[PDB]
């Protein structure tokens, strides 16, 4: 089964790199540190079925951060509408989006 000699002896052989929001080398992050932190802090203490039920908001936010399916679909919809308007001649892109922009530092 699952022995717990690491919890019994108090050592941490492989427990500090179980997930993304856990002890990055110098001081770095893992691109979804806040979302994974919120999800784990939600799910701790009520784990299993209750964590699957009433931490669905935090899990959905974290999964959206990590996989970015909804952002991809939103950006694809925007670009598809833009290309349709370009074909229909009803849209001209601004100078900053298409071509020369004013650069700021």
């Amino acid at each position: 089964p699952f022995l717990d000699i690491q919890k019994k002896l108090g050592i941490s052989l492989d427990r500090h790199f179980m997930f993304l929001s856990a002890e990055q080398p110098y001081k770095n992050a893992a691109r979804c540190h806040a979302f994974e932190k919120e999800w784990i802090e939600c799910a701790h203490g009520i784990g299993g079925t209750r964590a699957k039920k009433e931490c669905k908001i935090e899990f959905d936010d974290f999964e959206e951060c990590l996989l970015r399916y909804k952002t991809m679909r939103r950006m694809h919809d925007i670009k598809k509408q833009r290309e349709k308007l370009m074909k229909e001649g009803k849209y001209t892109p601004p100078p900053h989006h298409s071509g020369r922009e004013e650069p700021r530092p």
């Binding site: 002890e23 399916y69 991809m72 694809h76 670009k79």
Partner: protein, 172 residues
């Protein structure tokens, strides 16, 4: 210059297809060398260069020893490259046509968004720290020396036990 990683991934798929199609192991090692170089290029494009160069060097040594062994024992009078049977070539081009068909199907079916033709090359690198020192790959592999000493010691024991294992297998 956006679909560079996609072209590399397709080349990796072709190399793995040839390796699956199983030539003589000389050409199998050739296909695995090409696939290793392509995967190194993919890792380098996605980020740090240490992992790609490591897997390249490791597979160069591995396929060299493989070449020695398939010259020594895993050889035959007429080692088939790919054209000894027309079925192998027909199956390679059939797999290529199936790859094109499936990626066209997944581009047409853009609801899930796994492969998009218009959105290709737009979501390769998600977020990077623009200002920052010591954030490249290899710092974590160094952190194996200080933060994952358990990973380091299981790898070292694997290599040590492997030396004993290979001596006892080939003791004869």
């Amino acid at each position: 210059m956006n679909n560079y990683i996609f072209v590399l991934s397709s080349l990796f798929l072709v190399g793995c297809l040839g390796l699956a199609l199983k030539p003589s192991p000389i050409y199998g090692g050739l296909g695995l060398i090409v696939s290793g170089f392509v995967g190194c290029l993919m890792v380098l494009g996605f980020g740090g260069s240490f992992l790609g160069l490591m897997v390249f060097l490791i597979y160069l040594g591995g396929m060299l020893v493989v070449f020695g062994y398939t010259t020594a024992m895993a050889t035959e009078e007429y080692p088939e490259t790919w054209g000894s049977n027309w079925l192998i070539l027909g199956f390679l081009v059939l797999g290529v046509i199936m790859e094109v068909f499936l990626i066209c199907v997944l581009n047409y079916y853009d609801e899930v968004g796994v492969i998009n033709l218009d959105g290709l090359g737009d979501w390769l690198m998600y977020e990077v720290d623009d200002v920052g020192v010591m954030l490249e790959g290899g710092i974590g592999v160094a952190a194996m020396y200080s933060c994952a000493t358990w990973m380091m010691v299981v790898a070292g024991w694997s290599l040590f036990a492997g030396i004993f294992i290979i001596i006892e297998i080939t003791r004869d």
